[PDB]
From a paper:
Contrasting with Enterobacteria, members of the dominant genus Bacteroides often encode several [name] vitamin B12 outer membrane transporters together with a conserved array of surface-exposed B12-binding lipoproteins. Closing of the [name] lid following B12 capture causes destabilisation of the bound B12 by a conserved [name] extracellular loop, causing translocation of the vitamin to [name] and subsequent transport. We propose that [name]-dependent, lipoprotein-assisted small molecule uptake is a general feature of Bacteroides spp. that is important for the success of this genus in colonising the human gut.
Here we present X-ray crystal structures of B. theta BtuG2 complexed with cyanocobalamin (the manufactured and most stable form of B12, CNCbl), adenosylcobalamin (one of the biologically active forms of vitamin B12 with the bulkiest upper ligand, AdoCbl) as well as the precursor cobinamide (Cbi), which lacks the lower ligand and the nucleotide loop. The positively charged cofactors (Co is charged +3e)20 are bound at the same site on the negatively charged face of the BtuG2 beta-propeller and make many polar and hydrophobic interactions with protein residues. The orientation of the ligand is virtually the same as for the other structures, confirming BtuG2 as a versatile corrinoid binder.
Numbering used by the authors: 33 to 374
Write the structure that this text describes.
Amino acid sequence: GKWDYGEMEDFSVSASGLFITNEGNFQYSNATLSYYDPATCEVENEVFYRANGFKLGDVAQSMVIRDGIGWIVVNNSHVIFAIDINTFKEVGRITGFTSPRYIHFLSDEKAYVTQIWDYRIFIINPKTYEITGYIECPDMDMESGSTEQMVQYGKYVYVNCWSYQNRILKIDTETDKVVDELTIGIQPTSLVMDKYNKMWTITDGGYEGSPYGYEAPSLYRIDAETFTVEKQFKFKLGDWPSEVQLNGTRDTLYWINNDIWRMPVEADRVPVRPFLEFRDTKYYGLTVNPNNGEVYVADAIDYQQQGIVYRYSPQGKLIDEFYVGIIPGAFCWKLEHHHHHH
Ligand SMILES: [C-]#N
Ligand SMILES: [Cl-]
């Protein structure tokens, strides 16, 4: 059950819903997009292919919604697609990226797109669907370059550098230049900013046999104003953590480290018990509903079969679970009233 869908389908879905990107298997070009309606507990799978008649490509990595348009990063296809969020039809695309990762909008005419296998962050004009410039990251090359997730702090964007890197970088958006850096443990995976302007990042520890490193990974709380580590929470060699995520008021942190972990951002210590216990599968993506705190956990299972998403209440009770595509890795909320918080 994948592609025998016939003619293009005309979708008209709920004003409120949840996109799930599915990476597919790297180099097989079987990435897909799913759309879940939390009010009816119904999922639609392969919706980009069904609406457009052609496939997304290889490693759908992330997605952002802005002003009615969803922007889907297809990491191993050199492309970002822009789709209508109600019909899933393509409205445009930007090609020419080395290996794009995440998108951060500064205006209708300016966004940053991070990359792997490149030392540059690409600057785009989303209104004209063009690459307009580059930010050169210091002490990075094409052979092992990596920039990943982004958060904004005033006029600055902070970005974690993931694969074969060990830094958070600070970008002045007024000049499009890196102006500072912070070295931490190897391979920070993700980055969020809490309501107290503390950034959180968690590293993956590298891997056995890596030319760059293999070490016990850590979660870090970093002060954004002074760009300094406040506390390092070190885990165990052989753990491979990922994906810090916040709730909608940016006061409760979740992440993946076999189990799903949860901590108030004010806490001194990680709780003894996780939010969701490891079950001998592969928890791989994570999000929190910004309005009601429900926690969604994407499980790749074994990286081969169809993955599943679990939907839990903020108190840890299962609400629903639904099968998606292969290696579901990221989420994007479609909310009727745009949620922001400070
Ligand atoms: C692969 N990380
Ligand atoms: Cl699809």
